[PDB]
A paper describes a structure:
Moreover, each of the individual domains preserve their respective folds: the central split β-sheet motif in the catalytic domain characteristic of the ADP-ribosyl transferase (ADPRT) superfamily; the three-layered α-helical translocation domain; and, the Ig-like jelly-roll fold in the receptor-binding domain. Given these structural similarities, and for purposes of clarity and simplicity, we refer to these two DT homologs hereafter as Albireti Toxin (AT) and Peptono Toxin (PT). By striking contrast, we found that AT and PT do not display any measurable toxicity on Vero cells even at µM concentrations.
The structure was subsequently solved using iodide-SAD phasing. Whereas the homolog from S. albireticuli (S.a) displays a Tm comparable to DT (46.5 °C cf. 48.25 °C), the homolog from S. peptonophila (S.p) is significantly more thermostable (Tm = 59.5 °C). Of note, however, AT and PT contain both Cys residues (C217/C231 and C239/C251, respectively) that bound this region, and the crystal structures confirm formation of the inter-fragment disulfide bonds. By contrast, in AT and PT, only Y54 and E148 are absolutely conserved: in both, an Arginine is seen in place of the H21 residue; and in AT an Asparagine is seen in place of Y65. The T domain of PT contains three His residues: H272, H276, and H364. Two of these residues are structurally equivalent with His residues in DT: PTH272 ↔ DTH223 and PTH364 ↔ DTH322. Rather than forming π-stacking interactions with a second His residue as in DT, PTH272 forms an edge-to-face π–π interaction with PTY296.
Residue numbers in the entry: 4 to 606
């Protein structure tokens, strides 16, 4: 009856993983039962309970270690916390469900009806516990499931991308009710703890940022290593069901080799040891620098003779000359390392060549050759990046950032096909659209009852964009309610996914005049390519003020929308946040910094 597929799952691996924010590290002690967080934020909202809606509160665990590691940051500041392996009880029932209703998202009443129809609800009749109890908050979904000793396995409305061959790596999330978690779930291992401080809530906003700058380095390297270990085992090992015969590359070695070669070839030629006062912006001079040292980089990179370099003198020089224009109006004392790498994404695909894909023969040498050549020439065009605080050289930050960007899009594995989308909008060669016409474009604030709401949209390179277009995805905004109990963000459920990785993001609510809105920013530079589209889940809770109590009810926020920024964030903005792209008067276009995607909110 209820278009939901329900399956009882027998697990083979009972150890799952949980990323925690700095304030939640104290709740996870190895060898102890899990502690349900009693901490609250400044508004009184719980932190670490899985949702602001009690129906969906629980211990959310990821099957894969590298997915959970992406969650282990403080939402507002991005300070990394800790990562833990936890053991699930074997005496309970694991129930995977899948919504097959394209017109309606999952609700507590729908799920419990589907579970009753399969003979899974043992303790209550339909008269004792049905939708009327959930709609009146007399009973809550996950708490009732915990008494039934049920752990939910959930894929939501978007699981993972399918590649061009038709292969889809499964993504599983465990929703463990808190009564099961605190009584039967144990912390098996402390994988890694980054936050060593005392009372994170005592820190003010300033010193939270200082802590993040100290810890973002180690956390980035651990996360990348986790994702590289998963890719090697599941996607690269030929004996794995999900292998495609790909020639996977050692991207950590590629980074260190590219950085060593750039440093050596720069420190041996004073011509390449340029300062900001004698930067080279002429395309012709930059082409000669390419052609003078490309044969030397060929030998140092062990590139086989006859194997084509994925770069050309012309494209690298135009890209570098263009970056000199945009970097020209910037100061070194206020330029972030991550901002510099994000700023080289525009134009990167036309010049580097391996951002969209790399050949399966001599690939490791081609990658080192491309990154080393690109970093060498760009270092001459924008020498200001060598003056950033704590950079040892312009060529080293450019080579390291380039290798990091290219590794993130996995050019040595098959590309991903974007899901179909609805009501698309396009700006600056970037298209966004809702994943489901009826579920995502129209949010019902009060039916079945006020509470948790989420919708998905996809980010992709536009159809008519030039080949190899790469775009920086630097910010995601979402309209919120101007008054309380209308539309508030649920940052625990905001979710960004690219390739097979979760993109770590800060989430914060900002108030400008009478407007409230969410600001979601990836913690590390994020590059959109045709091979790696991006899916975003935006999550909210509605309330008793979401709509009016009159004959023709209007609902708030009015003119709801999300917006994706596709250009580097400005270094010259007085108020840091511009609410402009969320306003319905905003015009999507060829040169717009944002692409705005509106939706509707009714009863």
């Amino acid at each position: 009856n209820e278009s939901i597929v329900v399956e009882i799952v027998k697990l083979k691996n009972f150890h799952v993983y949980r990323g925690v924010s700095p304030i939640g590290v104290k709740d996870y002690q190895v060898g102890q039962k899990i502690v349900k967080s009693t901490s609250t934020d400044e508004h009184g909202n719980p932190v670490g309970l899985g949702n602001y809606d009690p129906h969906w509160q629980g211990l959310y665990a990821a099957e894969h270690l590298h997915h959970a590691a992406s969650y282990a940051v403080d939402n507002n500041s991005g300070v990394p916390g800790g990562l833990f392996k936890i053991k699930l009880p074997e005496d309970v029932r694991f129930v995977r469900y899948e919504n097959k209703d394209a017109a309606q998202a999952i609700t507590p009443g729908r799920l419990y009806r589907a579970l009753r129809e399969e003979g899974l609800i043992k303790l209550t009749t339909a008269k004792e516990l049905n939708e009327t109890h959930f709609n009146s908050n007399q009973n809550f979904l996950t708490n009732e499931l915990g008494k039934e000793k049920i752990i939910l396995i959930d894929t939501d409305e978007f699981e993972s991308f399918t590649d061009i061959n038709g292969m889809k790596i499964p993504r599983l999330e465990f929703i463990i009710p808190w009564n099961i978690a605190t009584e039967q779930v144990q912390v098996s291992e402390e994988v890694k703890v980054w936050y060593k401080g005392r009372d994170f809530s005592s820190l003010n906003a300033k010193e939270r940022l200082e802590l993040m700058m100290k810890l973002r380095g180690p956390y980035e390297n651990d996360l990348t290593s986790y994702e590289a270990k998963f890719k090697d085992l599941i996607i690269c090992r030929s004996a794995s069901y999900y292998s495609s015969g790909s020639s996977c590359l050692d991207w950590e070695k590629i980074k260190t080799e590219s950085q060593r070669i750039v440093k050596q070839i720069i420190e041996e030629h004073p011509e390449l040891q340029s300062h900001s006062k004698n930067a080279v912006t002429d395309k012709e001079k930059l082409q000669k620098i390419y052609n003078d040292y490309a044969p030397k980089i060929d030998k140092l990179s062990s590139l086989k003779e006859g194997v084509s370099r994925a770069t050309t003198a012309l494209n690298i020089a135009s890209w570098a000359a263009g970056l000199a224009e945009t970097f020209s109006n910037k100061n070194a004392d206020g330029l972030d390392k991550a901002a510099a790498v994000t700023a080289i994404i525009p134009g990167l695909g036309q010049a580097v060549g391996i951002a969209n894909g790399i050949e399966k023969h001599d690939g490791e040498a081609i990658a080192i050759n491309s990154i080393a050549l690109s970093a060498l020439v760009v270092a001459q065009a924008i020498p200001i990046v060598g003056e950033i605080a704590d950079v040892v050289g312009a060529g080293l930050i450019l080579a390291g950032g380039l290798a990091q960007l290219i590794q993130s899009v996995s050019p040595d594995t098959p590309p991903h096909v974007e899901p179909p989308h609805f009501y698309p909008q396009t700006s600056n060669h970037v298209t966004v659209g809702w994943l489901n016409q009826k579920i995502d474009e129209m949010i019902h604030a009060w039916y079945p009852h006020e509470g948790y709401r989420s919708h998905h949209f996809v980010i992709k390179i536009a159809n008519d964009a030039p080949e190899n277009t790469t775009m920086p995805i630097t910010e995601i905004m979402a309209k919120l309610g101007s008054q309380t109990k209308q539309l508030d963000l649920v940052p625990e459920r905001v979710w960004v996914y690219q390739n097979n990785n979760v993109i770590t993001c800060t989430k914060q609510t900002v108030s400008l005049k009478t407007d409230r809105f969410a600001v979601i920013r990836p913690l590390f530079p994020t590059m959109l390519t045709k091979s790696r589209p991006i899916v975003v889940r935006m999550a909210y809770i509605t309330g008793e003020n979401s709509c009016t109590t009159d004959a023709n009810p209007t609902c708030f926020p009015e003119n709801p929308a999300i917006a994706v920024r596709v250009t580097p964030l400005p270094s010259n903005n007085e108020c840091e946040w511009d609410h402009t792209p969320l306003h319905p008067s905003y015009q999507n276009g060829d040169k717009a910094d944002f692409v705005r995607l509106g939706y509707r909110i009714g009863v």
